[PDB]
């Protein structure tokens, strides 16, 4: 037959759910976002296309925080990502209120995953048009996760999604193969800047603004903080030099 790709929860004869895959397409249209796990934390980086010079730089922040220790960035439909972050904040508040401790990173990952998966069970709702890289530091160390519109998610040494996901994954594979001991938080910030600059080649039409955040047990005391000022400029300089 035909027309299986018209409803959200319908299986195709090959076993797939084509609506989720169209959401994946919507994600692939988005800008590049990456996450790098280091020996005591995580780093998140995102490219922000400068549509016009009328945009105020450093405003229009894309990286979001969950609780006080979780960082979340997403590629695709930004409002869908904001909705997912709102749900995640509710889940974290509920978990903390009941169990006192802040939500562990795997628990938060599964909360987001169950939410997104539930959004593939009915024809009355649309799947999420974002792929979400998130994570942070908990009692068992650092955790990085990536979550797909199907509700699928995994833990990663490094993760990347968006229009420049290919070159970003290549650079991340190189970093993983060359550093079995692990990167440091600051070195990982510099590498994230470099990988964003490199993956911008797939979106090289418009100029971009780099946005970096990190959660390091030693550099940020286990809290999520935006990389600003001198450290941001140093990472930008590192990337500029390394791409030239």
């Amino acid at each position: 037959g035909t027309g299986y790709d018209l409803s959200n929860s319908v299986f195709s004869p090959d076993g797939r759910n084509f609506q989720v895959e169209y959401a994946v397409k919507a994600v692939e249209n988005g800008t590049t976002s990456i996450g790098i796990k280091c020996n005591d934390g995580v780093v998140f980086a995102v490219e922000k296309l400068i549509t016009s010079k009328l945009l105020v730089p450093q405003k229009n922040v894309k990286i979001q925080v969950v609780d006080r220790h979780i960082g979340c960035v997403y590629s695709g439909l930004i409002p869908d990502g904001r909705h997912l972050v709102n749900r995640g904040r509710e889940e974290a508040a509920s978990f903390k209120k009941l169990y006192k401790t802040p939500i562990p990173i795997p628990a938060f990952a599964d909360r987001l995953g169950q939410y997104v998966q539930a959004h593939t069970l009915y024809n009355s709702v649309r799947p999420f048009g974002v792929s979400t890289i998130f994570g942070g530091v908990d009692k068992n160390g650092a955790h990085l996760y990536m979550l797909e519109p199907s509700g699928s998610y995994w833990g990663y040494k490094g993760a990347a999604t968006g229009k420049g996901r290919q070159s970003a994954k290549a650079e991340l594979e190189k970093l993983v193969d060359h550093h079995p001991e692990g990167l440091s938080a600051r070195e990982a910030v510099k590498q994230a800047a470099k990988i964003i600059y490199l993956a911008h080649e797939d979106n090289k039409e418009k100029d971009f603004e780099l946005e970096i955040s990190w959660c390091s047990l030693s550099e940020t005391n286990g809290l999520h903080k935006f990389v600003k000022g001198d450290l941001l400029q140093e990472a930008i300089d590192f990337a500029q030099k390394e791409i030239n």
Binding site: Y4, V10, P13, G15, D110, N123, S152, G155, K169, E173
Partner: protein
């Protein structure tokens, strides 16, 4: 017609959505088997981590449902984790209400009834998964019970699930036909794990490193999963055999 989109009967009397969910169960290209020892139950599943960026410790399809019940899923990981969370909740509530641990077959029947509900109600889609529950029930002993998107469930002497399921099933059938017993006559669970890995190697015609497998062992009053080094020790013991 739209009898192919929702769970209503086709003129042939079929539910095509159930069949396509069955098809989706194979999407992960992973095979698994489960066998019963003298006083234990072992599950083996293929572990395939293609991306080097992945954290291989988080790539698993075997779940600890409770202290006593373990479940391995053949299907996509979103529906797998859906079923896993639901089964954990059901087991906890069963314990809270009835004062004893939920048996393997009872949890299997509950999950199968929920799958049947998805099979008969139009707004709920089936889960594209096959759930293999294992334990050492305090009344039944080593137990294997498996559910499918059709709401069907049954117990097994042994079982297999996946793209190459038929070959593994035939292998185990031949072994049990030769042995004339319905279990693996071994007192240690390590030797039962070795049996399972050996017969899956035979049926699939491939060799495994310690990173190509997930192993789950259920003994009286505990279900657990083996580490990469425990799997490596089992592989070494297998290699030293004839």
């Amino acid at each position: 017609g739209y009898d192919r989109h929702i769970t209503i009967f086709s003129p042939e009397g079929r539910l095509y959505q159930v069949e396509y969910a069955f098809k989706a169960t194979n999407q992960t290209n992973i095979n698994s088997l489960a066998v019963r020892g003298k006083d234990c139950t072992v599950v083996i599943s293929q572990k395939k981590v293609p991306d080097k960026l992945l954290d291989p410790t988080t790539v698993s399809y075997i779940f600890c449902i409770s202290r006593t019940i373990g479940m391995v899923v053949n299907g996509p990981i979103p529906d797998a984790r859906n079923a896993a969370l639901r089964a954990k909740a059901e087991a906890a509530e069963f314990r809270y209400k009835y004062g004893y641990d939920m048996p393997c077959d009872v949890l299997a029947k509950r999950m199968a009834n929920l799958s049947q509900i998805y099979t008969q109600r139009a707004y709920m889609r089936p889960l594209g998964v096959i759930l293999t529950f294992v334990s050492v029930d305090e009344e039944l002993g080593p137990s294997i019970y498996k559910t499918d998107p059709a709401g069907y469930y049954v117990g097994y002497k042994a079982t297999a699930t996946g793209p190459k399921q038929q070959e593994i099933t035939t292998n185990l059938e031949n072994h049990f036909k030769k042995s004339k017993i319905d279990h693996i006559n071994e007192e240690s669970w390590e030797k039962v794990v070795e049996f399972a890995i050996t017969h899956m190697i035979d049926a699939l015609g491939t060799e495994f490193s310690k990173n190509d497998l997930e192993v789950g062992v259920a003994t009286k009053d505990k279900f657990f999963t083996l580490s990469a080094e425990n799997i490596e020790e089992r592989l070494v013991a297998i290699a030293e055999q004839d």
